[PDB]
Design a protein that fits this description.
Chain A: Residues 12-65 are annotated as: Sigma-70 factor domain-4. Chain A: Belongs to the sigma-70 factor family. RpoD/SigA subfamily. The complex is a heterodimer of chains A (92) and B (64). Chain A has helices at residues 2-13, 18-28, 38-45, 49-64, 66-69, 79-88. In chain A, helix 3 (38-45) packs across helix 4 (49-64). Helices cover 66% and strands 0% of the residues of chain A. Chain A has six helices and no strands. By secondary structure, chain A is an all-alpha fold. Chain B is α+β, with helices and mostly antiparallel strands and 64 residues long. Chain B has one domain. Helix content of chain B is 34%, strand content 12%. The longest helix of chain B has 11 residues, at 18-28. The radius of gyration of chain B is 11 Å and the shape is globular. Classes of the chains: A mainly alpha (92), B alpha+beta (64). The interface between A and B is medium-sized, with 12 and 15 residues. The structure holds iron/sulfur cluster (SF4). The site of iron/sulfur cluster has 13 residues of chain B, from helix 1 and helix 2.
C-alpha cells in the first residue's frame, strides 16, 4: 500500500531525466529522508541555484501533467506523501 | 478513459521547439477533459508545457 506508492513514485520519477529526477529526490528527501535546499543541490551538481530553481519548477509541472501523474491518482510525514501532496495539492 | 497525453512520450507536452508544441496542442483537441485540464492548469498557474491544448508560460497562455 505505502510500499506500492513508493514503487509507483519511483517508476514515475524514472520517466524524467537523471538531473530532473535527481533535483526532485534531493528537494523532497526521497532517498535519504532529508529535504535539501536549492542552494545545497546547486553545490552537489555544480549548477547555479537559479538553474536548480528553474529545474524544480519545470519538473514539478511535468509531474502534475496527466501524461505522468494519472497513474498516481489511485494513491503527511513521509517524503513520498509530501511529494504526492505537492503534485495533487488538496487531493493528497 | 484514454487521454491523448497517455500516447507517445510525455515530454511531447514539454517540447523544446514551436513545431513540437504544435503537435502536443493538436493531440489535446479530442481530449474528453480538455476544457477541465485548461481550467485547472490556469488555476495552478503552470509555468510551461501544453495543457488543455494551449501553451503555458508563467501561468499565461501563449496566444500568438
Ligand atoms: S487536455 Fe490535458 S489531459 Fe487532455 S490530452 Fe491535453 S494535457 Fe492531456
Amino acid at each position: 500500500s505505502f510500499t506500492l506508492l513508493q514503487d509507483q513514485l519511483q517508476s514515475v520519477l524514472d520517466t524524467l531525466s537523471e538531473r530532473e529526477a535527481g533535483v526532485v529526490r534531493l528537494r523532497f528527501g526521497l532517498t535519504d529522508g532529508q529535504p535539501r535546499t536549492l542552494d545545497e543541490i546547486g553545490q552537489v551538481y555544480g549548477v547555479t541555484r537559479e538553474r536548480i530553481r528553474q529545474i524544480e519548477s519545470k519538473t514539478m509541472s511535468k509531474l502534475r501533467h496527466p501524461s505522468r501523474s494519472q497513474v498516481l491518482r489511485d494513491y503527511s510525514g513521509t517524503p513520498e506523501e509530501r511529494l504526492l501532496r505537492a503534485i495533487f495539492g488538496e487531493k493528497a | 478513459p484514454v487521454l491523448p497525453c497517455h500516447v507517445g512520450d510525455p515530454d511531447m507536452w514539454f517540447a523544446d521547439t514551436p513545431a513540437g508544441l504544435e503537435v502536443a496542442k493538436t493531440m489535446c483537441v479530442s481530449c474528453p477533459i480538455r476544457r477541465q485540464c485548461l481550467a485547472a492548469a490556469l488555476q495552478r498557474a503552470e509555468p510551461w508545457g501544453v495543457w488543455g491544448g494551449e501553451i503555458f508560460d508563467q501561468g499565461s497562455i501563449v496566444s500568438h
